[PDB]
Amino acid sequence: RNRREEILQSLALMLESSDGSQRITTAKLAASVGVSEAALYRHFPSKTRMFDSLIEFIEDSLITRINLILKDEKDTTARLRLIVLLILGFGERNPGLTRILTGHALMFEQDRLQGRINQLFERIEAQLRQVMREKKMREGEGYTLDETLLASQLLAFCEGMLSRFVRSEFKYRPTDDFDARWPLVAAQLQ
C-alpha cells in the first residue's frame, strides 16, 4: 500500500525527469524509494504491473472526466472543446504519464501495454464520434462532413500537441494559448 504507491509515484516522477527518456531499471526504482531490489519485487514482479496501474489511472481520469462533461454540458461544440481541453490539460498535468500516452515510455515494455493505450484512444475517438453524431438531433443541424473524419481530425490535433509536448521535454505545453488555438480547431469542424 504505502510502499506500492511510493514505487508508482517514483516511476511517474522518473518518467517525467531526465531518466524519463531512458529505460527505467528495477534497481534504480528500488533505490529511489529506499528499498532493496528484492523488496520491490514483493510488490511488483515486473515494471509491467507498474505501467498497468499507471495506464489504469490514465483511463480512469480521462474517461471519468469525459462522462462528467457530457452530463454537465449539452452543447456539442462546448462538449468537444472541454474534451479536447481535458486531454491536453491532463497531459500537461502529468508529463510522465503523457510519455505513456504517446507510446514512448512503452517502447521498452510489453506490447499489451501499448495495445491498451491504443484502445483508450479508439475509445475516446468513438466517444468523439458519438458526441458529433448527436449534433443533428440536438441543434437541428449536424456536420456536413463525415463524423469519423472530424473525430480522427480532432484526436489527431491532440496527439500532435502531446507529441510535441513530449519531444520538447515538456517545454511546449499543450494548453498554451488554448483560447487562441481552439477557434482554429473548431474551424476544422467543417
Binding site: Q9, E16, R65, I69, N94, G96
Partner: peptide, 11 residues
C-alpha cells in the same frame, strides 16, 4: 475541469 495529477508535490 478538475484535472487530477498523479504526482503529488506534498511528497
Amino acid at each position: 475541469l478538475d484535472i487530477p495529477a498523479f504526482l503529488r508535490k506534498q511528497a
